[PDB]
């Protein structure tokens, strides 16, 4: 599925939350400069891309 969160776009498949993040943290970009952990800005959902 294509997805668009907070203006930033992309595509792929989705997985539920497994990490912990930080109380204000919503962006989970990894070592390879790739978005793989996002947060829903309307309900507290953390997702894996």
């Amino acid at each position: 599925v294509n997805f668009n969160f907070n203006g930033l776009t992309g595509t792929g498949v989705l997985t539920e939350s497994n990490k912990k993040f930080l109380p204000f943290q919503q962006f989970g970009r990894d070592i390879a400069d790739t978005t793989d952990a996002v947060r829903d800005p309307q309900t507290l959902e953390i997702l894996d891309i």
Binding site: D30, I31, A32, T34
Partner: protein
Amino acid sequence: LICAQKFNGLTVLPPLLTDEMIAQYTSALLAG
């Protein structure tokens, strides 16, 4: 880090001979 490298189309390919057949070849060499 391997899957992140794989996901941008930089796909590695497995060797034709696996490790167990290499071990079998070496064991045959030691036996001979």
